[PDB]
Swiss-Prot record:
The active site is at residues 15, 33, 104. It catalyses: Selective cleavage of Tyr-|-Gly bond in the picornavirus polyprotein. The chain holds residues 869 to 1008 of 2193 of the full protein. This is Protease 2A. Homodimer. Cysteine protease that cleaves viral polyprotein and specific host proteins. It is responsible for the autocatalytic cleavage between the P1 and P2 regions, which is the first cleavage occurring in the polyprotein. Also cleaves the host translation initiation factor EIF4G1, in order to shut down the capped cellular mRNA translation. Inhibits the host nucleus-cytoplasm protein and RNA trafficking by cleaving host members of the nuclear pores. Counteracts stress granule formation probably by antagonizing its assembly or promoting its dissassembly. Zn(2+) 1 binds at residues 50, 52, 110, 112.
Amino acid sequence: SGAIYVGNYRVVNRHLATHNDWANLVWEDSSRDLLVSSTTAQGCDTIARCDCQTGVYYCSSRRKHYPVSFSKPSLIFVEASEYYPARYQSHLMLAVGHSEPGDCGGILRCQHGVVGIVSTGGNGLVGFADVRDLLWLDEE
Ligand SMILES: NC(=O)[C@H]1CCCN(C(=O)c2[nH]ncc2Br)C1
Ligand SMILES: [Zn+2]
């Protein structure tokens, strides 16, 4: 589990969105595993606007932050899971690291701010849903 709280937005994994998220929906994209809902309180996270390929992510199954090198956001074939069939997930970045299904929502960050959230894992891989292209998270 886990969310990004930027301005009056909550960014979660689409597959973990709550009823309250769907009832307060701003934007969702199944291809990216992303959903954004509106919040009453202002959040403290800042979004990175950069092409960093190194950063640090939170792994709930280890209670640990790990430094990683990650790929540029891409279209990646992701194996069928409890939440999606075998498909191409877009805007996904891959690194070597531990990721169990419940690690989804952990933040990946760089020197500039939040880069994305854990979206995929297994086999000693971890995939991150990028949010750096979502410039509207910074206004309105
Ligand atoms: N966005 C997706 O399609 C995800 C959904 C959860 C499962 N997915 C994984 O890769 C995964 N496997 N083991 C741990 C993890 Br995390 C695929
Ligand atoms: Zn950066």
